[PDB]
Each structure stands twice: as C-alpha cells, then as structure tokens.
Amino acid sequence: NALAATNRNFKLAARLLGLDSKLEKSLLIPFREIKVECTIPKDDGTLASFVGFRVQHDNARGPMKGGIRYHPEVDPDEVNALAQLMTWKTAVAKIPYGGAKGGIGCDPSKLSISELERLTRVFTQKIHDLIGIHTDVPAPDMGTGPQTMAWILDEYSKFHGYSPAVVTGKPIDLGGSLGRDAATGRGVMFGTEALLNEHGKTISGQRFVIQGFGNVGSWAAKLISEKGGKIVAVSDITGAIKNKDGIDIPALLKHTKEHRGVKGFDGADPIDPNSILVEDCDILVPAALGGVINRENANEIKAKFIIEAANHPTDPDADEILSKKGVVILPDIYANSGGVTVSYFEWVQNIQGFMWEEEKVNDELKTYMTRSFKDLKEMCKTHSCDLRMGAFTLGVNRVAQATILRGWGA
Amino acid sequence: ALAATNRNFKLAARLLGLDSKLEKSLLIPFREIKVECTIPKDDGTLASFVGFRVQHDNARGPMKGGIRYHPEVDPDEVNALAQLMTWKTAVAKIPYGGAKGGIGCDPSKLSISELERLTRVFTQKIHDLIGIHTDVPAPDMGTGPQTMAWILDEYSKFHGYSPAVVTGKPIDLGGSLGRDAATGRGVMFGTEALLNEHGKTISGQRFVIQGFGNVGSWAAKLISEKGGKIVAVSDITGAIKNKDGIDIPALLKHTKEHRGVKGFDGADPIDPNSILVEDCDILVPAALGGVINRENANEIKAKFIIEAANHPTDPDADEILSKKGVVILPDIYANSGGVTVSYFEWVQNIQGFMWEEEKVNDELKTYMTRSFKDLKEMCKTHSCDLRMGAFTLGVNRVAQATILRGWGA
Amino acid sequence: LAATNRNFKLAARLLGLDSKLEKSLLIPFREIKVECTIPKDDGTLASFVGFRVQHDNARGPMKGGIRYHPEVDPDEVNALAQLMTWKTAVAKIPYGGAKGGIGCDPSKLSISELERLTRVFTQKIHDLIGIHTDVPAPDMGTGPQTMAWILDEYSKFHGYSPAVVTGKPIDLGGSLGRDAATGRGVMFGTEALLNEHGKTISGQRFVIQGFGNVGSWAAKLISEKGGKIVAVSDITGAIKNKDGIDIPALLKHTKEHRGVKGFDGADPIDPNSILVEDCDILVPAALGGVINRENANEIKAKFIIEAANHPTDPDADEILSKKGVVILPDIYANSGGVTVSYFEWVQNIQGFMWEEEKVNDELKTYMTRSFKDLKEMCKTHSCDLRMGAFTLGVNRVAQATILRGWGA
Amino acid sequence: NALAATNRNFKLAARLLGLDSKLEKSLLIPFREIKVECTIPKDDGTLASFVGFRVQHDNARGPMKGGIRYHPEVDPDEVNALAQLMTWKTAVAKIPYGGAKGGIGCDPSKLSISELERLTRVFTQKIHDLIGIHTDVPAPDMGTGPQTMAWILDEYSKFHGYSPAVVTGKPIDLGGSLGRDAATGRGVMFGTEALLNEHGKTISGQRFVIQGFGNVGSWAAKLISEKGGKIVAVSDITGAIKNKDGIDIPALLKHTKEHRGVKGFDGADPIDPNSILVEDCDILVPAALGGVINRENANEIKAKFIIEAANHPTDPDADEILSKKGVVILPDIYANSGGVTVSYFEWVQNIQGFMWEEEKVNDELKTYMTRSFKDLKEMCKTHSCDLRMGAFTLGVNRVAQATILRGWGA
Ligand SMILES: [K+]
Ligand SMILES: [K+]
Ligand SMILES: [K+]
Ligand SMILES: [K+]
C-alpha cells in the first residue's frame, strides 16, 4: 500500500520536472531483466530447482547496486519497483551507482547450510557474466548476509580472479568496511540532526520513540542517546518497553544481546505493543516494517518529526494526514541512505586496494549525507514540495541528466 | 495445439521413466532475458521497445531459435516455442538446444532506417548473451536475411567477424545454398521415408497441398518431380483442382506471374474450404495450424497427412485420424529440413568453407532418413504413434545429455 | 622410469642432434601441481594433489591422459608425457605430449566424491589447458563419464568446449569407432608388417596375450581378416586351438562371464606359457616387462606386436634382436588410440561428426603413412623397428622445434 | 637452520588454535607449484636451458607476494617453506596478500647482462598467465633487483597492457615507491619502540649492539640514534667497534660509505668480531645472518630484549634459554616485516595510479606495524605463549579464518 506508490512518486517527480514522456518511459523501463534456473542436489541426493533472478534497472550514473533476497515470495512487479527505487536512492545519495535488485525464490529456513552454500555458488555461476566490479555489485538483503557475500565472492573469483569489489557487505576479514554495521543507524542519527537543525533544534534533549530494535533501530538508539537524545520507548518482536525519563541504551543493549529481545528489561516498564507509535514524544522513528503508520493511526501520532528509518513505513493516506497537521517526515529514501553510502565506501576501499580507518568511513558518510540533505532541501524550495517529493525529484533529475548527457545512438 | 506442447512433453516424460525432479528441471528454461531497446526515430523523438530471448536448454549444444519482430508477445508462447525447439533439434539429431527471442514492435510502422537502428541496438543489448557456441539466432516473423545481415554486422564489432553467429544470412554473406528449398525438400524426404515403410513410393500417389508458399510450392515442385500427382493445391488466392494432375512447372509460372493460383488454366477452381477433404492419398497441410481439427477430421480421405506447417492437427483430430488408420507425419519431424539445413549453414561457417548445394541436399537426406530410423524405432519401443515417438525421442536425448553432464555431485 | 630416456639418447645420437638441443627436448615445457580439496560425503575435508606434465607442444596442442591412481612416480609421469610427444610424432598427428592425474584411490570414493573431485581438479587447471593448448583424455582410473564432467565444468569458464577433452560419451560429441581404435590399430600395423615380408594376416597363426579392451578388439578384426587366433590368455586363464579360436564365439562367452576360462571351442593351456606358444605372430597386450631374460630364447614367433606399453624391457629386446625376431614397438602399435582421439577432436573442431567408416578409413590412412615413414627410418639408420620409431618421432619434434626457433 | 623449523612452528600454532587436522593439512599444501623450461640463446648463439619455478602457496587472503631468486641452488622443500612463511608473514602484518616464492636455477655471475635480460623475458613469457595484478605479485630477491623487475614489468606488459602493479621493487622511474630503501630498518626501529612502550620504556637512552651493518643494520642504527638510542657496539664485514658512550652514527655512516667498512673509525675502539653478541647492553639486534645465537652463547647475552632483524637469527635452543632468563625476543617474522609492508604500499600506489609522498609511506608503515604489534600481543595474552608463537598463531589464525569464510564448494 506504500510500495505500489513507487511508480506514483516517480510520475509525480517527472511531472514536477518538465520530463518528456518519451524520456520518462525510458527511465521507467529497466535496462535488463534476467531469470536463471538454479538446480542443486539436496543433502538427500535428490534434485531441487530454484529460480534466481536479477532486475538491473538503470546504469546511467554508474554500476548497479542492489541486494540479493532469499525469500519464497517473488512478485515481478514488486522486485522491479525495488530495483527502480534503488536507482533514485543512489542518485539522492550522490554515489555513482545505478539501481538493481535480485534474489532466489527459496526459503532458507528449510535448507541446510550445506545446501545454502551449494545454492549460492550455483546462482553465482549462472550470473557471473551479468555482474562485476564495474557492472553490478550485489549486497545482502532479506535472507542473506555476510557469509552469503563471502560465498559469492569466492565462486565469482574463480571465474575472474580475485574480486573483493564484486559484492559489498563482506566480512571484515574478506575486505568488508569498518563502520558497515552501524552505517544505516548512524545515517539516521545524522539525517535527524540535519533536519532538526533546520528547525532550530538539536538531538540533545529531544524525546525519541524507536519502533523496531534490529540492526538499524539498535544502532540509531545508541548513537542518538550518545548525542544527548532521550529515548523514551522502544519496541521489538518480543515486546515494547517505556521509560519516561529515558532508557539507558547501553544497559538495554547488554540485556538485548544476552536475552535476545528487549522484553524482560529491568529499567523500563513494559507497555502495550500497539501504543508504541502513538506514544507521546517529539520524534518517532519507525525502524521495523512498512505500513505501520496508516489512515487508522495517523491522527494519533504525537511527534512533530517522523524519521523513516525503515522502508515504506508511512502509507500515502497517512502522509497527507500528517502534512495537514504540521508533522515533518524525513523520507526513507534519504533517511536510511547511510547503508548504501557506506557500501559505496566499501567498494571504493576495495577498488583502491587499501582499507580506510573507521573515522574516515564515518567522516565521509557525514559529508555525503550533509551534502545530499542540502540538495534535498533546495529541491523542496525550488518545487514548493514536501521532503519526500524533493527526494524523488532530486533522484530522477540526476538520472535523467546523466541519461541525456550520454545520448541515444544518433 | 501449441499449448498442447506441455501435454506432449508431460506424456513423453511418463512414457520414459523420467524422475519428477528431472522433469521439472527440463521444463525450467536455462535463461530468460528482457532488455530495453530505445532508439531515436527518424523524427528525432525517442522510441522504446522491449527485446527478449528465452534460452530454454543447452544440454545438447548451442541454442538455436528465431527472432520475431511482432507487437504481440505472449510469454507462455515464447517459452513454449523455445521448449519445442529443444525437442525438435533433438529429434533432428543436430547438436543444438532450444531458444526463442524477438522485439515487441510492429515493423509495418517503422522505417527501414529505424529497423536497422532497432536491430543494431538489440544486438548491442544481447551480444554478450549469444555467440558462435552459445546461441545462434535466425529469422522468424517480421525478420529476414537482411535483419540477420545487420545482426552479423553489429555483433562483429564486438567479437570480430562471426558469420556463424546467425543463420538465414544472404548467400553473399555466408548463407547456405539450398536454404530456400530446405523445408520443402525435407517434406518430400520424410514422405518417401514414411511411404517406404509401407512398401509404397511417391510415384503415382495423389497429393493435396493446402498452402502454396515457400514450403508448399517447394514440396509440390520436388514431389511432382518424383512422380507425385498433385491433384489439388490451395493458397491465399483460392484453390484449383485437377484429378489427372496439376502441371506444377506451368502453375509455378502462373503463380509467380499472377501472384496466386486462381486463374490457372489446366485446373478447375474449387471451394477453398473443401481442400482438406479432397480425395487423395497424401494430404499436406502447409499453411496454418489447426486446419485439421475436431470438425473435419473424420472427413479426411488421405491415408497419410504430412504436417509441413506447424501444429496443423489439434489433439482432437489426432485421435480421430489415428483410429481411422491415418498415419500422420508430425510437424516436429516433417518440416525439420529447415532447422537441419540451418545447422548446415552454421557448420559451413564454422569450417570456413561453403558446401556445394548437392552436398547440402545429400547431407539433409542422410540426416532426415537416419532421424526417421530412430523415430521409427522409438515408436516400436513404446508402441506409440509418430508424434509421441518424436517427443519421447527428443526428451530422452536431452535427458541423457543432462544426466551425463551432471549437477555438480 | 629411465627406460624411455635410454631409447631417446640413442635416437638423439643416431641423428646428428646437438647436445644442447637434445637437453631442451628432454626438459618438459611445464610441470603443474595443484591442491584439490573437497568435502567428503561425511562432511570432513579431503585434500588431493592433481598434476599435469606438459612435455612438448612444438607440433601443436598437447595430448595426454588423466590417471586416477594412488601411486604417483614423478619419474614415470614425466617419462609417459615424454613418450606421448614421440608417439604423436610417429602417428603424424599435430599434437604434443602431456600427462596428468590425481593421486587418489577411486575404489575408495563415492561417485559424488569422484565428481566433486573431478570438477575441483578442472577448476584448478582449466586455465592451463584448452581446445588449442592441451586436450586431456581418459587413462587408468578414469573413463568417459570423467571426461563428461571435465567437459561440463570447463565449459562454465570458457563456454561450450566439446573439443577440450576426448574419450567423451557419444551423446556429448565423442567419436564413433573410438572404442575399437587401439585394437584396430594393432591389426593394421600387423598387416603392414606382414606385407613387407611377402606375408599377409590371412593364414598367419596368432597367440594373443591379454584380453582386455585392447586385446579383445585385436582378436576380432584379425579373425575377420583371415587371421587364425590359435591361443588367447587373459586374467582368468589361457585357451588354445591349433585350428583357430572363433573370436565371436569367444567374445560371446567372455561377455557373459568375467573371463574365457570355460570356453567351449578351445581347450585350456598354461597361463604362463602363452608367451612361448608356437605361432608366427605373438602379441603381448597386458603389461610391461613381461618379455624378459627368463623366456626370450623360448619364443617361437618371428613377429612380436607390442600392443601393451613397454612389454619388452631392454633385456629381452637384445635377446630377440638376434636370431631374427621382429618386434613392432608399442610407440607405433597402439597409436591407433591417440590417432582416433585426434579425429574426435577434429570432428568437434569442425562441429560435424563423421560416419564411422570415415574414422576407420582415415585411421587406415594415418597408420599406413606412418609405417612407411617408420620403415624408411629403419632403412636410413640400419636399425630395428623400435629405434626406427624413436628416430622418426624425435626427428619430427626437433624439426618442428628448429623451424619455430628460439627467438635469437 | 631455523628455516627447517618452519613446519615446526606451524603445527604448533595450528595445535594452539583448534585447527582441524584436515584443515591443517590443507593449509600446509600449496595452492599451486609450477616448473617451466627457460631456454635462451647465449651470446655465443648456443642454447642454454634453465628451469624457472614459482610456488604459489596460499591466496585465501589475497594476491600472492614473493621474491624471485636467480640462484643455482634450488631445494624444492626450502622454496616451499619460504612461500609458506610469506603466507604467515603477510597475515601477521595484516596486508591483504598470500605467500609465494619463485626463481630461476642459474648463476647470474656466469651470465652477461644481455643473457640475463633474455632469460628474464623468457621466464616472464612462460609464467605471465600465472601471475597478475590480482593473482601473484613478484618482487626482487637474491640475484635479482629493480632492473630485473623492470624487465618483468616490460615483458609482462606486452601480454596484458601496462601493469606497473605486477611487480614491486621497481625503479622509481617506473613507479617504485619512496622510502623503500629504509623500510626494513625503519620497521625494526618502529617495532622496537612498540615493544619497549609495553615495558614503560622508550628507545631513548638504552644501549644497542647491532650485529651486521648491511642495508637493514645501517638504517636501523641511523634511525635509532635519531630517537636517542645509544648504539654502543657495531659489527660488519670488516670487524667490530665499541664506544661505551655511544658510537656517533652520522659520523660513522660517512666513514663507512667512503671506506666500505667500519675498519678504521676514529671515535670507536675496535673489539673482537666474534665477541659482538655477548656485549653488555639493553637491546641486542642480530642483523646479519641466521643461527648466530645458539646454545653456546645464550646464557651470557646481557640484553633483556633481542630484536630479530635478521632472518632465523635465534636457534630453537636459545629461544627457551633466553625465555628462562627474562629475555624478550621480537621475532623476525614481525621485526623485519617493514620491507614486505612497504612493498604492499608500492602495489597500492600503482593500483591507485598515484604515488605517495615519502612521509605518507613512512606514516602508514608506522600505523601498520603498531597495529600488528598490538594484535600480536593480544594473541599471546590469549594463548600464554612467547612473541614468536604469538606471531605464528596470529598469522595462521587469519589465514584459517579467511579460508573457512570462503568455504569449500558443496
Ligand atoms: K532505462
Ligand atoms: K532446464
Ligand atoms: K622442451
Ligand atoms: K592450501
């Protein structure tokens, strides 16, 4: 209900710009769509056939970037929307990538680790000629992780020699970047301060509600509290906890790693899991799932700021409700761009054959996100639009310019 | 009768002892590609088209399949034809796999300069996905030898001169002699093979040929030259009959002059809808699919039907004509002379040395008789009709190569 | 071992070969060792060494088998690779000599492990071989399926490459007549040898020691050319018939059973006396060094066809050299195999398979020409057949080496 | 030779870690071993045939690195040991290389410069397909030098285009690195300060005896005196000299370069050339050859610290004797790693197409060696072992982790 909106925002941005319909159509059509057969022997000896795939949407601004999703549900339209979304996101970030997205229709929880490596290596064999250091650089996604990237790297290197830059999100021992783990969360804290400063405020003192406590949410909470932010409520799959005076995030993290959830945490009262988004605060950070803010609860949001750390957490219905209430929303396409930005930095480090210290990684991230927020701000002033539309017009403009500069045939 | 393809495959897999897991893998195509083809039109404005190529199976060698320029593109049909080509090349005993591709577009609305432009972009967008030993495209609806010349030309910018990358080229650019008559000549070859098995020969037999294009005319020419009596021929302009035999050479001059058979002295005109039920020995549907169907199958008087066209017999008519004792030479074999000679064109390009036409035709006789022998022996093995014998033979060969090559332990 | 090197220096001195050029001809072009580590079926790791000696490629791509065997003597492997270089030159096929394998016991591995290992080996050497570089073939412990796996795995790195290996299944581009190739070659050379002496295969009495893949095929085609196969031995025992063993009937018996011992139509004889049987033509077809000091004087044949490799070590060579026993050397006699393996490659290069009659007809052409070239070397240097073969082969490699030059 | 101890140290380190015996077996086996025929025309026209070779031991952690030896003595076992040592050495240094080692069995002192170029190019032609920018990067060694590398670079570039990164040790005019001459000596001084700092000490004031005065030894004395180190005794090819207040190193360096030895230096009294190891001081630097410290001279060593600047300078017996005395030994695998580390920097600069100023080379060298020393120490803390074993365990562990992360197929 918010991802079908991708094409809508695009067409909206294209109309904000003076985009010609013929160029718009070209930008909509992906550069390449690939489906491959992945047949492996299972541990019981019998054959198992899976379909791997890769949508390579756009490469005008450089090599394509996108995750590999191991998930049984594969909608052709949905995957295409994500590949296109990555094209604008990389453009908003001003990193020299295009957008792509791939995966294998499969359920990893029903495969042995032996089968998952076997499956991953076959998939790499079937697409090795379609990706590459300067063509398409995959990344982890739902159902895959650093070990997956390691296996891809190993098999790919058999066909083209050692190629650490062919995937990002690798283990540190295999050429992964420092700061990759904290990247998206750190970006969320960075972008929040940029937006607050634009209103004469700073993170220090503000009250935060963080819905979701996975990698992104947990890191956000850590770095934000370290900036003086008052984290008053946090939820995860195990429950939701509140502390009006501020949750001690270091203590929570220590509890959360040991106990595998925020539930049972001494030092914060448990609260109704369905009250977390409507809890009283200044800044609301949806950091788990999509569609959690909708027509059913938009009027009950109390924050003046919503930092879309998760993807598509706010449906179009809630978007217009909160606008007509003075709520500013930092759109996900910008708010969580620290991840893909740092992945660009990982690739750069591999291209340069020399890793950066973490202070440099983080320093460049601050620079890239400061600049992109400024450009994002100026697009809004130019087109008298909200932040989300400013991000899409900014992204579509850059792709369109690069496309035009490179030309079509004769 | 086209969507019936999976029916023939699923049956053949059951006639063979194929494991259900291996059967599913054989159904899954090796690769499916969609590419953006945007070109500047003659007026300067942009035009965007989608090109595509389904590469179904390559167990038995490089993939082979036509390129279709047509605005209507059904994904299932494209996949079905690619799968069909996999079985057909296996029946032919030529070392290819099956593929099928094209661009969704209407060439009648494009200038010739735009069509070259569009063809070159498509080649640039897929050149890394085809190749001398990978995938050898060929013409199909909306493309022809000129299109192949353009592909050859653009592909060679990326890989050096590569005449073997496409078949159906002009003779001047390494196309094969005998390429025009190949399908038609193959039909006559398969007819004699089938008749020889019944102690009969072409000489004397009465032929009805529905459709008089390249395939139909060539069959009529070469069959009449073997002593066959063509008693009726129909085409887009009408149908003409002569119970004592139509003089094909004279008819060919009339049809080349008058762009149709209607008006030919030496054959009375007859109802174009009556052509399939005319009295004869051998009926050659050579125009369209499904022309022999549930409504007219019982009314066929021929003891043999030579499927020169593709899918001329619906499953319904297959059983009616089977029980009435009609032997049907199935399309997958009967018109394989074309794909066989396209293999010969490629072989000649691979060997850097063209064949005399007599060699082309002589190898074709060898390839189609030997494949008929194997086709015959499969039917006896499984007590099945020719069409089912062909699918089981084709699926068995691919399965053998797939199993020999393995799935990485 | 050093058995080969002994013939080589002898041939090198027969020709006027420069000692420095001779040293280079002896040194192999390349020696490769690679680690092949696979997970075993129980999950634990297993590490094997693969290897390939690439001896000489002056005359074209190198050719040689892959042997899966636990015993790996570096001296043997180099000797075999060097021998292949000479063998391909006597055959006049445009190949050089190479030889490789994996130290492992295939009898202790599942087919899953054997496939895994084969593919890993291919990954480890794919960049060191190729359709125009080095074309492997089956050998001890490998067969057509092994070639199929190599073909499949190699093709992931370089596209479909049927010509990268020979000995493939026919379903994957293997040659017709490949199975009978070596056996037919021995029959061809026997007729050439007899024709030089005013005799023909027809009428001559054959005792055939060994009835494996090669021996069985030899017996078949000679019986069909009128040869009287009067005694045959193999791993299970020996049978004799002065009027001739019916090779089809013998083949029927052996195909049902696992040996000829029990064959109606030939009474059994002593398994170790076959070499000393009364006949005109004796064919050692099993193992090396079997013709030796202990039984050389008791050979009654005037003709010995070396179907096996190194069946006569130097000791018997000189004993039989006197008294007039003719020996057709292994380097030529079993070259039918490597010749038809060349034809398999040619067919794959041409993308168009040959009828079997063409394979066999070209086989007859290539071996006749090489025999004629072989005899003239013997006449030129007043030497026996074995040295004549070495002189011919080493001459061809040296000529090719010199024409191509050394930079300068 | 403490060279044959290589397999000795490894199986120990592999046992200190929980290394599966089968994985230990694979880590022992080299990835590839190559022998090639190198036949060239000599200047008199006659043929000469040589055998070139390259052991490529391990590449789990990256491209292989190793020297090319032009030397008539070729022991296969020793060459394999050296390539294996390099695998561990690069892992301790934390540079992304594996270990290799090669050469040509030949005596360059019996060859003209024209024949040496001919032979060098023929060797490159025979192995060009087995090395590469991301595969295996050779370097000078005994019998080869910058000119050798220039010829390799030139001939290789005919086959793969300009490839300055294919070898290190190049002439500076062809992309060689600044500071490469002082690298090993400077590295010795860096590690010495790192070691002393853990003991609350600094280079300043302490007494140095430096045995051997080659490239490494001379540079060490130079850099050490400049930090305040008191070099009280020096040995070289011509003899040994002493000065209880400290030998004036700048003045001596002037004396040694003109005269080509230390024999004759005003400002330092001569001493027994065979007494050099038993001189009283704080830090003794064996900097010439291996096995110079053995059981016969171990008990009377007066230093609390031995900086193994040379390779294999301490035999196993003395290692335990000096441990049983409170003597700390900085092992050669770490102490002289400045060379290989800067060779990595040379490669990096060529990969990036942009040379570093010398100060940057030296600052990065300091960074890499302090970081590796800190890592080396924490390994000792975990395994309660000496510095030498701490280095092997650290290197073997890193290789083992990379190997496992990349996996084995199925
Ligand atoms: K596009
Ligand atoms: K398939
Ligand atoms: K040689
Ligand atoms: K290893």
Numbering used by the authors:
A (entry chain A), D (entry chain E): 2 to 411
B (entry chain B): 3 to 411
C (entry chain F): 4 to 411
Q: What does the publication say?
A:
GDHs release the ammonium cation from glutamate in a reversible, NAD(P)+-dependent oxidative deamination reaction that yields 2OG. We have provided detailed structural and kinetic information about the functioning of AtGDH1, one of three mitochondrial NAD+-dependent GDHs in A. thaliana. The asymmetric unit of both crystal structures is comprised of a homohexameric oligomer with non-crystallographic 32 (D3) symmetry. A subunit of AtGDH1 is comprised of 411 amino acid residues (44.5 kDa) and can be subdivided into two domains.
